[PDB]
């Protein structure tokens, strides 16, 4: 299995599994969400990201073992129901390889493994949590840095959970009635759409 330095940079065009490539191995990271993924939005206010600072590809192989450290560390310290890691990066891109008699006559590659192309500032990992936990999350993510190549840097967000609302904005909107909790993620009452449809849901609003 080829050392990651080969495929590290984002060189070739995004070449995915399709009705041309068809043949490809599976990913390693076949599972993205961890811990208490069923948890409610209000439970885990504090998002800590792990953000690229680099325009590098990430082999699935790494992404699994990065995920498995932040899994295995956070679960060790604060437990399984402590947090929700969501990997926000999907090995779609396929890496080829010129395996080998012909030399370089007809040297186009067969598929080797998947990789997840990652721009600068792009989130990779994100662990929502209670603000109490923070360090025990981070310190897991600091271990998952060691699995990845290049550079990335963990960043405590000023956004509620994964919710695009900021920490203050969310609290304003929630303690009103504009927010209702769905399963995963918060749905917002608009000022738009059929009112009957908007009244049935969000009965806490309008009162």
């Amino acid at each position: 299995r080829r050392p990651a330095r080969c495929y590290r940079y984002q060189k070739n065009k995004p070449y995915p599994k399709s009705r041309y490539n068809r043949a490809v191995p599976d990913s390693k990271i076949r599972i993205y969400d961890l811990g208490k993924k069923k948890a409610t939005v209000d439970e885990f206010p504090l998002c800590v990201h792990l953000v690229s600072n680099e325009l590098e590809q990430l082999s699935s192989e790494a992404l699994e073992a990065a995920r498995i450290t932040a899994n295995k560390y956070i679960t060790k310290m604060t437990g399984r129901d402590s947090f929700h890691l969501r990997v926000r990066v999907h090995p779609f891109h396929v890496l080829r390889i010129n395996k080998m008699q012909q030399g370089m006559r007809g040297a186009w590659g067969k598929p080797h493994g998947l990789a997840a192309r990652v721009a600068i500032g792009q989130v990779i990992f994100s662990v929502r949590t209670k603000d109490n936990n923070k360090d025990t999350v981070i310190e897991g993510l600091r271990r998952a840095r060691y699995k990845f190549p290049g550079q990335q840097k963990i960043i405590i967000s000023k956004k509620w959970g994964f919710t695009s609302l900021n920490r203050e904005e969310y609290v304003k909107k929630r303690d009103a009635g504009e927010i209702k909790d769905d399963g995963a993620f918060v749905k917002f009452l608009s000022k738009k759409g059929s009112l009957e449809e908007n009244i049935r849901e969000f009965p806490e609003y309008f009162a």
């Binding site: 009112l195 009244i199 309008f206 009162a207």
Partner: protein
């Protein structure tokens, strides 16, 4: 499950078919063909003979087509026919032949081709296209729009054709879809065509119902027994009309009764008005406040 197929996605993506098409009004596939003239003729218009049988009326216009929006040269409605004699049956074959024949004579008066191109005066129901006169102007050439109506051997549309043809227009056409054409032989029974020109096919159905079933003969034809116009006088009505048209078809408009402005003011009572942005917000605000205390 059910199926679910009118998501935002659908609408956003969906293409509105023109509007005429959407109001099942017209065949743009045939408009393409019918309207577009030789570009090497340039601005010369291509006049096209609109013929439309509404439920209980005929409308016949000779139309030119522009980018602007197709313009009318002359218009003959069947409801203008009682000024020439015909009260009863204004969706017949004969009525068509009236409206058709009249069209020619409307237009030909408004093109200065009255005297030359009189059309078929005698009317034997003989198949004759209006041949041109040597060393003179040619006849006004109109192509028939059937449109989204069907053409079926012996339909009224071709009445209005044959009228216009026999009224002086050159309208390129063929024989077969006139009635009395032998399906099993390339021929015309010219006697059977006269009859349709002079409501003769109607005067036969008059004649049969006189003896047999006087139930429907009093139901239908109430116009005929009221005016005391019996079967065999129908020919003379259409005959005299044709001549009456040939005389003086130059179009009088209606007496009006009430001005445009009076009309509008009267219809404007019934049309409902829209609402300001605030007036909708007032309704929504009222709807919101109706559900804060629950009832």
């Amino acid at each position: 499950f059910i199926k679910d197929i009118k998501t935002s996605a659908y609408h956003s993506r969906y293409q509105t078919p023109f509007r005429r098409r959407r109001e099942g009004k017209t065949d743009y596939y045939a408009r393409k063909r019918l309207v577009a003239q030789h570009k090497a003729k340039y601005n010369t218009p291509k006049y096209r003979l609109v013929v439309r049988f509404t439920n209980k009326d005929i409308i016949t216009q000779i139309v030119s087509s522009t980018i602007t929006g197709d313009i009318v040269l002359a218009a003959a409605y069947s409801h203008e026919l009682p000024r020439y004699g015909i009260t009863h049956g204004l969706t017949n074959w004969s009525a068509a032949y009236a409206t058709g024949l009249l069209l020619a004579r409307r237009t030909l008066q408004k093109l200065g081709l009255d005297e030359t191109y009189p059309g078929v005066e005698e009317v034997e129901g003989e198949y004759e296209l209006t041949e041109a006169v040597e060393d003179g102007p040619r006849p006004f050439k109109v192509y028939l729009d059937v449109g989204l109506q069907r053409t079926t051997t012996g339909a009224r549309i071709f009445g209005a054709l044959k009228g216009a043809s026999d009224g002086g227009l050159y309208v390129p056409h063929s024989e077969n879809r006139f009635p009395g054409w032998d399906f099993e032989a390339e021929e015309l029974d010219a006697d059977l065509l006269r009859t349709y020109i002079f409501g003769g096919h109607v005067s036969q159905y008059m004649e049969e119902l006189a003896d047999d079933d006087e139930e429907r003969y009093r139901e239908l034809f109430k116009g005929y027994l009221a005016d005391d116009i019996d079967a065999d006088a129908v020919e003379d009505i259409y005959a005299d009309a044709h001549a009456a048209i040939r005389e003086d078809p130059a179009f009088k408009p209606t007496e009006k009764k009430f001005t445009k402005e009076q009309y509008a003011a009267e219809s404007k009572k019934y049309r409902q008005v829209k609402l300001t942005r605030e007036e909708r917000k007032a309704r929504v605000a009222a709807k919101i406040s109706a559900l804060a205390p629950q009832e």
